[PDB]
Amino acid sequence: APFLNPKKQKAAELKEKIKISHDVTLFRFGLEHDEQLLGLPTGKHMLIRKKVTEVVMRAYTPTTANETRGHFDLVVKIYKANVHPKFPEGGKFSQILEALEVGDTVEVKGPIGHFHYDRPGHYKNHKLESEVKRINMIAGGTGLTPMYQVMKAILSNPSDLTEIRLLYANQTEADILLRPELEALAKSHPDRVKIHYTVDRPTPGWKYSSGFIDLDMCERALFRYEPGTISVLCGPPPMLKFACHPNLEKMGFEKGVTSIEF
Numbered sequence: 001a002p003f004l005n006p007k008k009q010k011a012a013e014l015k016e017k018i019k020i021s022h023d024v025t026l027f028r029f030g031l032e033h034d035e036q037l038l039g040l041p042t043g044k045h046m047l048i049r050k051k052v053t054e055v056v057m058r059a060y061t062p063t064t065a066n067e068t069r070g071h072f073d074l075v076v077k078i079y080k081a082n083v084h085p086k087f088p089e090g091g092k093f094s095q096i097l098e099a100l101e102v103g104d105t106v107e108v109k110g111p112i113g114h115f116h117y118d119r120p121g122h123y124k125n126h127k128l129e130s131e132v133k134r135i136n137m138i139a140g141g142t143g144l145t146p147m148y149q150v151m152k153a154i155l156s157n158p159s160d161l162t163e164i165r166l167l168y169a170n171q172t173e174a175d176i177l178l179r180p181e182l183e184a185l186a187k188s189h190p191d192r193v194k195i196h197y198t199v200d201r202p203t204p205g206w207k208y209s210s211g212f213i214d215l216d217m218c219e220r221a222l223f224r225y226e227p228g229t230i231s232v233l234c235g236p237p238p239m240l241k242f243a244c245h246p247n248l249e250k251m252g253f254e255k256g257v258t259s260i261e262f
């Protein structure tokens with residue numbers, strides 16, 4: 001019996017809270033028992049909530065999935081107060097999570113989502129089903145973890161030959177999430193995945209792209225459309241609508257059919 005039940009809010013207890021960097025924390029939440037299946041299909045996420053002094057809820061794709069029993073890990077960017085001048089109050093739920101102590105609980109509802117990569121080289125999107133050979137992934141900031149979950153499900157499977165191209169955009173090089181992990185995946189599956197990065201404001205020793213995602217960047221980093229090739233996207237709404245879809249549409253993709261948003 002899996003932990004996730006889409007009809008229920010299920011309590012999960014914080015087991016470990018481990019700093020990845022000054023503003024990125026890994027939260028390790030226990031399931032009902034240490035051998036329990038999470039029950040999160042590839043392509044889906046969860047809603048995590050807590051009642052504080054007001055019920056606050058946000059979507060998260062854990063960096064672990066069904067392969068890890070008894071717990072799930074969340075990698076969370078903490079949007080701290082009095083750091084950014086445009087956002088002096090910071091992020092509501094990421095600070096709630098950061099303030100948690102081991103032993104505190106959150107409520108979890110899931111699985112959530114319309115896209116399901118259900119078996120090697122195959123997916124379901126709402127009511128539509130199809131074989132797939134190549135997947136483009138475009139992520140911005142925290143939009144990375146839905147991509148990371150799919151990349152691991154494909155690359156760690158000894159019977160899946162699906163190829164991947166990731167294009168990951170962030171404001172600064174310091175904002176890139178899971179960079180060592182992404183680099184280690186590209187290093188350990190060199191003929192199956194490529195990863196390309198862009199930052200708004202780069203430093204002199206930067207070996208990748210600068211500025212917003214454009215047609216040239218999409219053509220360098222991603223596959224063009226052919227039957228069997230899809231593009232999946234997760235990031236800030238303006239980035240997707242204005243920088244991604246127009247350029248994928250020029251590369252032969254179709255919004256909602258071959259270009260799918262998480």
Ligand SMILES: Cc1cc2nc3c(=O)[nH]c(=O)nc-3n(C[C@H](O)[C@H](O)[C@H](O)COP(=O)(O)OP(=O)(O)OC[C@H]3O[C@@H](n4cnc5c(N)ncnc54)[C@H](O)[C@@H]3O)c2cc1C
Pocket residue numbers: 045058059060061062074075076077078079080081083084087089090091092093094095142143145146262
């Ligand atoms: C499918 C899915 C999966 C996700 N997975 C993850 C994941 O694994 N990890 C993760 O960290 N997030 C993930 N997110 C994002 C998550 O849902 C939240 O939006 C995020 O945690 C921020 O919420 P918040 O309550 O802290 O910020 P809010 O209070 O909702 O603030 C709104 C926005 O203000 C901006 N902002 C506020 N303060 C600052 C600041 N100090 N500096 C810069 N910008 C600021 C941010 O862009 C923020 O998103 C995912 C989202 C989706 C839809």
